[PDB]
Amino acid sequence: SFQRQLVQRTNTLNSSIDNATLTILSRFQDILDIAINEGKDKYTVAPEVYQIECHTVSMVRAVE
Amino acid sequence: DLTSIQWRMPEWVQSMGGLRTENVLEYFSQSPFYSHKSNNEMLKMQSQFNALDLGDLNSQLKRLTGIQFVIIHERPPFLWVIQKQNRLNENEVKPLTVYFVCNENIYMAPNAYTLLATRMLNATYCFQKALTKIEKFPQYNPQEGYTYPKLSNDNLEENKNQSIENADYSFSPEDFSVVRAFMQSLHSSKEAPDV
Amino acid sequence: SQAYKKELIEQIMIAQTECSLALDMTSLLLSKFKENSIETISPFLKSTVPPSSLQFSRSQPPESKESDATLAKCWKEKSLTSSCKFLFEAKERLTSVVETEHEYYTELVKVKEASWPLFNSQGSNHLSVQYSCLGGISLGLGLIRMKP
Amino acid sequence: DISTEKTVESLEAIRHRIAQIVQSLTHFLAILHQSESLSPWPTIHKNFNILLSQIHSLSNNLAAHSHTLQTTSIYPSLEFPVKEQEPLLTTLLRTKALPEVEEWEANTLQEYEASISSQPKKKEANDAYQKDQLWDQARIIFMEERENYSWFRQLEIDRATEEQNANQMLTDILSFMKSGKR
């Protein structure tokens, strides 16, 4: 039918939107979880850096 | 520094007629890893003085608490395991760092977490490098996808499927075609006489 | 060109090796009894010696240098600075992209204001004009090529 | 003795993580091999996300068990001849970091000590503790604040009822043309 086509399309649009926004906000939100420094093992710090950069790239990507 | 570093005195071991039981401990005495505080040291002093006042090893070691390097295991004529320990009681003892004869060589036993985290370090570092090399490279444009600017094109010859049906007459790139097939047909043909 | 993936292959490969050694030594470590990990090792290693070479050793944490704690700070601060520079740079290039953006669809407004048919193309993604709107016989289309 | 079981189990999980990440590496190279040109970006970024999921899963896997991992040490047992495997087992004993990595570490310490030169007796790690607490508060306020904001019409569904009565009305009018009945 003519209706459900535009409707489901709208569903796709809203889906992509909420997914992108939620992506950005999530990636930023977890950086604060990564933000902790003191008390960590020297090795444990290392992955977290790459995690920061990857979260940032994920943010800019969802922006795209 | 006192970890993975190698050490050896092959002329010594060759001089000994090969390691046996006490003499391999003497080889540990040869080692930089050897401690003056070790019960083996003061027992060595006891051999220098009391001499006769000695009883094998463990019967002499276990009753004399302190730093020790008991031979828990061995693999003649190659490996010889030597566990460090610290006696407290007739029963109680603290296990300590392994040292061993890695064929006329001595290496301290690595901690598991240190090397697992080491490899994790190496991997995550390769990941950081993996990200940094390609950052600032996907020249994005919403209109044109993830462009990668280049000196020249070929080389090799979302749901945006919508377009007018018949199209023709029309235009639509076809930015390039067959030009690769020119020269490649030429080289496939240059080998033709060879074929 | 290509050298990026060409080097990246070396990077991921070497990292995969560095990890594979862990996978193997640990598989040997847990194959001391269970068959679950002996299956996973490379035959080249299984060809050497039967596993369970490793054994427990309860000996100290042991200890850590204070400078490592300084590294924990130094890495993270640089990472955060990299984060801010990254976000700022991305805002810059995206601002330039918007500069490219406003120029175009406004032109499309200039044409649509003059009442012309408009249609999307293939993967080229540019909108295109049905220039033969007055018609005659055959259909006609034309992409509005960007000309920086 | 009992803790050895803790090791076998925690590493039962960690080896699984290693299987996951190495398998991801195999799949990743398997993707890059498919390309003759450069691989498309989105798949690549997706791959890095898979990576982050894995390494984060492993760091999480380290847990309190990591302390137990610290307690342990690596030595060959009686079961293992070193007749030819010695050169490779030494590689297995190699807890040493990649030389470029430690080189980078010296590159970090040299400049931190350079900061110490520019700032002799001005340690701030202690202040950085309460600042980390500031991250701890800022994150919580950041979480709670987002919920305050709005986040996402049956009448449009009712439009279908409009089409419905329009349809029955069509049945009515066709009945009319058929018969003139009203």
DSSP per-residue string spanning B91-152: S-EEEEEEEEESSS-EEEPPBHHHHHHHHHHHHHHHHHHHHHTTTT-SEEETTTEEE---S-
Declared resolution, Å: 4.4
Tell me the angle at which helices D125-148 and A2-34 cross, rounded to the nearest 10 degrees.
160
Up-side HSE of residue D26: CA atoms within 13 Å toward CB?
A: 8
Q: Do A53 and D51 form a contact (C-beta atoms < 8 A)?
A: no
CATH of the domain at D18: 1.20.58.1710
Domain total of chain D = 4
Q: Do D40 and D32 form a contact (C-beta atoms < 8 A)?
A: no
Tokens of B159: 């749901």
Same-domain check for residues D11 and D62: yes
Q: Do B122 and C18 form a contact (C-beta atoms < 8 A)?
A: yes
Same-domain check for residues D12 and D63: yes
Same-domain check for residues D170 and D146: no
Which residue is associated with the tokens 């566990």?
Answer: B83
Print the domain residue range for D175.
153-182
CATH of the domain at D174: 1.20.5.790
Omega before residue B155 within 30° of 0, cis: yes
Closest-CA residue in chain C for A53?
C83
Is A38 in contact with D128 (Cβ distance < 8 A)?
Answer: yes
Alpha-carbon distances, residue B56 vs B62, B100, B173, C56, D164 (angstroms)? 11, 20, 91, 27, 103
Which residue in D55, D66, D132 is closest to A36 by CB distance?
D132
Which residue is associated with the tokens 């199209």?
Answer: B167
Same-domain check for residues D64 and D82: no
Interface of D with A (CB under 8 A): 45, 48-49, 51-52, 55-56, 59, 62, 66, 125, 128-129, 132, 135-136, 138-139, 142-143, 146, 152, 156, 159-160, 163
CA dihedral angle for residue D141, residue D144, residue D149, residue D151, rounded to 10 degrees: 140
Same-domain check for residues D54 and D96: no
For residue D161, the distance in angstroms to the closest alpha carbon of chain B comes to 31
Which residue is associated with the tokens 């992955």?
Answer: A47
Same-domain check for residues D42 and D15: yes
Distance (Å, whole) CA C28 – CA D74: 12
Alpha-carbon distances, residue D75 vs B75, B115, C1, C24, C57 (angstroms)? 12, 13, 47, 15, 8
Which residue is associated with the tokens 């369970």?
Answer: C52
* Closest listed residue to residue A39, CA positions, set D71, D128, C79, D104: D128
Of D39, D72, D105, the residue that ends a domain is D72
Question: C79: Cβ–Cβ under 8 A, 6 or more apart, which residues?
Answer: A48, A49, A52, A53
Nearest-5° Cα angle at D4, D2 to D7: 125
What count of CB pairs under 8 Å joins A to D?
Answer: 49
Distance (Å, whole) CA D75 – CA C50: 15
Question: A31: Cβ–Cβ under 8 A, 6 or more apart, which residues?
Answer: A52, A55, A56, C83
Same-domain check for residues D161 and D144: no
Same-domain check for residues D84 and D137: no
Same-domain check for residues D164 and D140: no
Q: Which of the 8 DSSP states describes residue C37? A: T
User: Hey, which residues does B75 pair with through a beta bridge?
Assistant: B79
Is A37 in contact with D128 (Cβ distance < 8 A)?
Answer: yes
* Gyration radius (Cα) of chain A, Å: 18
Same-domain check for residues D1 and D56: yes
Distance (Å, whole) CA B142 – CA B136: 16
Determine the residue type at B130: A
Determine the residue type at C114: A
Residues of chain C found within 8 Å of residue D29, distances taken between Cβ atoms: 9, 12-13, 16
Same-domain check for residues D62 and D81: no
Question: B12: Cβ–Cβ under 8 A, 6 or more apart, which residues?
Answer: B27, B30
CATH of the domain at D112: 6.10.250.2610
Same-domain check for residues D1 and D66: yes
